[PDB]
Design a protein around this ligand. Structure first.
Ligand SMILES: O=C(O)c1ccc(CN2CCC[C@H](O[C@H](CO)c3cc(Cl)cc(Cl)c3)[C@@H]2c2ccccc2)c([N+](=O)[O-])c1
Length: 123
């Protein structure tokens, strides 16, 4: 099935990221069952500084720029394949502290707070 082919792709990708390769096979499989892909185009804002957030993003394709207004926005850093962002939104109500903008065609694997709490809660 197409769901199985996507699950196999996500498993291979997670096993290529050292931080996630430390997880047991059982947990990676359950995480790959719930992750979904979101695609972004060059210049598209993935996250905005000051917005409320509920999603965590792992980059599976492309690069993003992280920027913020200190009072025009300043450049903070570029992230790419295997990096992630937005994790504070998984721990509870969160206000984003920086923009994350696609710097080319991007794909992220995403999970929201409700799905993350359900996954962790079942362990
Ligand atoms: O300094 C420290 O205290 C510190 C603490 C933690 C980490 C690792 N941690 C960093 C944030 C992303 C991810 O965690 C989120 C939950 O926040 C997460 C999202 C999904 Cl989908 C699924 C799982 Cl299991 C977890 C990752 C991680 C945490 C645990 C397992 C695997 C990956 C790091 N670090 O390596 O940077 C530094």
């Amino acid at each position: 099935s197409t769901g199985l082919i996507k699950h196999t792709e996500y498993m291979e990708f997670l096993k290529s990221v050292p931080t996630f390769q430390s997880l047991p096979e059982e947990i990676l499989s359950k995480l790959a069952d719930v992750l979904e892909e979101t695609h972004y185009e060059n210049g598209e804002y993935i996250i905005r500084q000051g917005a409320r957030g509920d999603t965590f993003f792992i980059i599976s394709k492309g690069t993003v720029n992280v920027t913020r207004e200190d009072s025009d926005p300043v450049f903070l850093r570029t992230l790419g394949k295997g990096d992630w962002f937005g994790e504070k939104a998984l721990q509870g109500e969160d206000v984003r502290t920086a923009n994350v903008i696609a710097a080319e065609a991007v794909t992220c694997l995403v999970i929201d707070r409700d799905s993350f709490k359900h996954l962790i809660g079942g362990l």
